[PDB]
Design a protein around this nucleic acid. Sequence first.
RNA 1: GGAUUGACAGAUUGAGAGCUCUUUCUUGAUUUUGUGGGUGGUGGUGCAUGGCCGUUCUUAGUUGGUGGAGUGAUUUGUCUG
Length: 37
Amino acid sequence: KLRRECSNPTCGAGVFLANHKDRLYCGKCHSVYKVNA
RNA sequence: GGAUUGACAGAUUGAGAGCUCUUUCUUGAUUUUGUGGGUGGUGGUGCAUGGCCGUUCUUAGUUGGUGGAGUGAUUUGUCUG
Ligand SMILES: [Zn+2]
């Protein structure tokens, strides 16, 4: 499967990642969990 | 394969205000917009009004009960010192 899973410690590695310019944004939370890669 | 709804990177504003936008994940089923239909307004209405306050006012005023006077208003009591 494409559309990357995340390393979310509040989830079971299933939340998708909003790919931006230098951002896989976790939308599960409001603002936090902005792991930059 | 999207009601409400949140944001970082940045023009953004006064903001380290995601509010709008490049954004794209999900926090999400709870009426998100019109009609019904509240609630608020420190909005006009104390000239529509509750209480309360002030003034008429430290000058003392007020009145039923039987009786008199008139016919009825009204008086007499409540007035000459
Ligand atoms: Zn994350």
